[PDB]
Design a protein around this ligand. Structure first.
Ligand SMILES: CCC(=O)N1CCc2[nH]nc(-c3ccccc3)c2C1
Length: 127
């Protein structure tokens, strides 16, 4: 029923890059999803205490959210676009795992995911 530490957003010994694909992930993909009317439940880690979801972190062992992703991108945490793409996919999958089909939260994730897929379809070729 307690919240775990959030995912890491800083690690000085992890090697980093700033690639055109990663810049796209921040400037197009994250920015597009973040501004959406359905973004709000996804803009920070799940607060299992506030939401009274004491089983959330029993079920979800690889938590991810766009606040974390935003921090990672702004802090140049990633080596490659795949890492960041995996984070978005983890976030969506967690939602689908934890919740029931047709719940509001699932409809919200599905809308965000549709947009995500459309933007990733146009991920620029690496420079
Ligand atoms: C991040 C989406 C998720 O799976 N959550 C667990 C189930 C759930 N129900 N309601 C929410 C939620 C709504 C608004 C703000 C934060 C979380 C959530 C968060």
């Amino acid at each position: 029923s307690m919240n775990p530490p959030p995912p890491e957003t800083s690690n000085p010994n992890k090697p980093k890059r700033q690639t055109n694909q990663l810049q796209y992930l921040l400037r197009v993909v994250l920015k597009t999803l973040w501004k959406h009317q359905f973004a709000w439940p996804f803009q920070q880690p799940v607060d299992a205490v506030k939401l009274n979801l004491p089983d959330y972190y029993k079920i979800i062992k690889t938590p991810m959210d766009m606040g974390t992703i935003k921090k990672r991108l702004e802090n140049n945490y990633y080596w490659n676009a795949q890492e960041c793409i995996q984070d978005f996919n983890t976030m969506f999958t967690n939602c689908y795992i934890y919740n029931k089909p047709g719940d509001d939260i699932v409809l919200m994730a599905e809308a965000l995911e549709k947009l995500f897929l459309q933007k990733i379809n146009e991920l620029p070729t690496e420079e």
